[PDB]
Structure formats: C-alpha cells, structure tokens
Design a protein around this ligand. Structure first.
Ligand SMILES: O=c1nc[nH]c2c1ncn2[C@@H]1O[C@@H]2COP(=O)(O)O[C@H]3[C@@H](O)[C@H](n4cnc5c(=O)nc[nH]c54)O[C@@H]3COP(=O)(O)O[C@H]2[C@H]1O
Ligand SMILES: [Zn+2]
Length: 357
C-alpha cells in the first residue's frame, strides 16, 4: 500500500477546527457542571479532571469523547486478586481512622460497586436538573466502569472514575514499560515516579469488588513524546509516522468492527489492543529512522503483521503489566481472533478496501 494512498486516508479523516471547538465547548460545558456539582459530597470532594487526551479516542466517530475523573487516596494498601496481575483489592492502612469513602467500605475492602452506584446516581440526578443543554444518560453496559451521556443527541461522553495513588507502582508492573532502548532508562525512571490509577473493573463468576491498574496518563505521555530524538516531529527533518500508523491501525479495527457490527466476533476487540501492539512495535523498532515518513506503508505493515501474530499466537502482553495477557483464551475465544485475522489478511491482500469510502 502506497504511503500517499494511506496519508490520503489520514488526510480525509481530519476534522476541521470548528468541529473541535464547538464539540469541545459543548463537552466542557457539561464537564464543568458535573465536576462542580460532584464537589458537593464528602467523598467526591477532592475529585478532579485527568487529561487522558480530553478529545476523541476513535477517529471514525469524532462525536465520542472520553474524560477521566481522578480521586486521590492516601497510603492505600493493594491486594492482588487470584494472581491476576492487573486486578487488585483496595484496602486502607489507617483503618482506625475515619475515611471519606468509609460509606463504601465493604469491611476492610473498599467496594467498587458502591462507589460506581453513588457516582452514576449522582450523574443521573444532575443530568436530570440541567436545562441549558439536551442531555440523556445512557443505559448501563455489561461490566463497564464508564458512565456515558448523550449531549444534544449527537455528542457521546464516557466518564470513567478512577482512584489516584502517588505511591510506587505495583510489583506486577516492575518488568513492564520496556522503553529503555527506545526512550532511555532515565525517562522510564522519571515516568515510574508518577502516580498510577485504579478503575472499577471486576475480574473473571466475577469478583465485583476489584480494581484494575491504569496508566492512561503514561500512555498519553509516551504518545505525545514518542521519538528517540527529543526534537522528533518538531522540525522538517524529523517527521515520523508513529502516530499515523496508530491512527491507521485504530481506523482499520474500527471500520472492521462496523462492517461486522451484526456479528459478535469483533465486539471484544478495542482500540486498547491496537495501542498496546503499537507500543510493542515501538519497542521493537526504537530508532526514528525506522519510522521515516516515506516508509509509512512499510511501517503500517509492521503494525499489521505483528498484530496478526498476536491474534495467531493468542498472546498480547499489557505494555505495563507483562504477565497480563490481553489475548488470553479466557478473555477472547479463538474463533473471534481467527475471524479478525482472516479479515485483516483479506484487507492487506486486497489493498485495504475498508479505507476506501
Ligand atoms: O484506564 C482507563 N482510562 C480511560 N477510560 C477507561 C479505562 N478503563 C476503562 N475505561 C472506560 O471504560 C470502557 C470499557 O472498559 P472495559 O474494562 O469493560 O474494557 C476495556 C479494557 O478491556 C481495555 N482497556 C482500556 N483501557 C485499559 C487500561 O488502561 N488497562 C488495561 N485495559 C484497558 O479496552 C477496553 C475498552 O476500551 P474503551 O476505551 O473503548 O472503553 C472503556 C473506557 O471507556
Ligand atoms: Zn515523531
């Protein structure tokens, strides 16, 4: 596939400045309201907005947003569940002390379901009272930590609540973030000093009171500063195609998901898998020269091939948690991965007709 053929698709995916300004304004307009009204509680007092991009995550629809609500918790003690390296129980070291979130304490373990229930209920009751904009609160999805709302029957916003921990990263993430050859071990050192987050997600019956590790902020960090050279993409001679490869991959997965929307094979595949795979390829190809713009197509293929391999071998390690396989037999069944593999292979073999619209 030609580089200009791909960059043409990327060119057509570009949304104008107005489409960003108006939608962004309509989003922040409700985000500020919900944010300020959430402060009217002892629990969600120190709530805050976390920058997980503050824009859209999927290229095509640009009417879908994703915001993350951070809530700091002091000196928490985590307890890994069932040797699932990603999922944890939240306990407090100072149990004798009275906690603001004490109402949600399921004993010594902080219940995620209660917090999600109160949070979501507050959102529903506030979305009821707003009159300046037409907003409806979307139905609860299957085991989703998010709360979605629709503004003016066109804008989708997924609000995800998350606990913040300034303490050192868990031992499961120790051998993760292998960016030493890519962004230097210094940057890894300084990045691991940053806080980590926790989202209310249950692990497989289901253990409904567990939390998942989240490093979305770090993903944004390495994503916006992606080159081995510090002046990468700041000058003409240092333009690369990492972000373009990520856009192309995400768009391919999205379009494939939409083509077979009627089926249920690709419903479990999300942009996070694509992101993860892309990070793995970045680790594999750390040199900026390996990401020359004129090599876009080739680069894209590298992102495709590897991804296919992960589907073929049923192995896709979480970039921060190596021992956690996103493509395990438990999470996603072989049949679906075979389907996606066949589709992607077809696309590549026929010059990606899914891009042509
Ligand atoms: O950490 C977060 N930061 C911002 N929003 C988040 C986060 N976690 C959840 N959500 C919000 O809830 C939606 C559904 O979540 P679900 O737990 O059911 O499945 C996730 C999950 O399997 C995987 N995923 C996504 N983020 C991570 C990660 O940080 N660490 C490990 N896995 C991850 O993608 C799938 C869906 O991707 P989407 O983003 O489309 O839709 C999310 C999102 O809206
Ligand atoms: Zn670059």
């Amino acid at each position: 596939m030609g580089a200009s053929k791909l960059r043409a698709v990327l060119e057509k995916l570009k949304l104008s400045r107005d489409d960003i300004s108006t939608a962004a304004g309509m989003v922040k307009g409700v985000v500020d309201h919900l944010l300020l009204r959430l402060k009217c509680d002892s629990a969600f007092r120190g709530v805050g907005l976390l920058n997980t991009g503050s824009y859209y995550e999927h290229v095509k629809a640009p009417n879908e947003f994703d915001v993350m609500f951070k809530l700091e918790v002091p000196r928490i003690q985590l307890e890994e569940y069932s040797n699932t390296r990603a999922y944890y129980f939240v306990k407090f070291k100072r149990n004798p002390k009275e906690n603001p979130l004490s109402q949600f304490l399921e004993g010594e373990i902080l219940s995620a379901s209660k917090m999600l229930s109160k949070f979501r209920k507050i959102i529903k009751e506030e979305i009821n009272d707003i009159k300046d904009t037409d907003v409806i609160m979307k139905r609860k999805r299957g085991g989703s930590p998010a709360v979605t709302l629709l503004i003016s029957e066109k804008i989708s916003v997924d609000i995800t609540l998350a606990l913040e921990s300034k303490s050192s990263w868990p031992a499961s993430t120790q051998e993760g973030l292998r960016i030493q050859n890519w962004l230097s071990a210094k940057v890894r050192k300084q990045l691991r000093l940053k806080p980590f987050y926790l989202v209310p997600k249950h692990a497989k019956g289901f253990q409904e009171e567990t939390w998942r590790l989240s490093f979305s902020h770090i993903e944004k960090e390495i994503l916006n500063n992606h080159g081995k050279s510090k002046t990468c993409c700041e000058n003409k001679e240092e333009k690369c195609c990492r972000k373009d490869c990520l856009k192309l991959m995400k768009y391919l997965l999205e379009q494939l998901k939409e083509r077979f929307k009627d089926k249920k094979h690709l419903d479990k595949f999300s942009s996070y898998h694509v992101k993860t795979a892309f990070f793995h390829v970045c680790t594999q190809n750390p040199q900026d020269s390996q990401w020359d713009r004129k090599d876009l197509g080739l680069c894209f293929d590298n992102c495709v091939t590897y991804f296919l391999q992960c589907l073929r071998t049923e192995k896709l390690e979480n970039y921060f948690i190596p021992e956690f396989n996103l493509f395990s037999s438990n999470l996603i069944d072989k049949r679906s991965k075979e389907f996606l593999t066949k589709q992607i292979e077809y696309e590549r073999n026929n010059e990606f007709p899914v891009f042509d619209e």
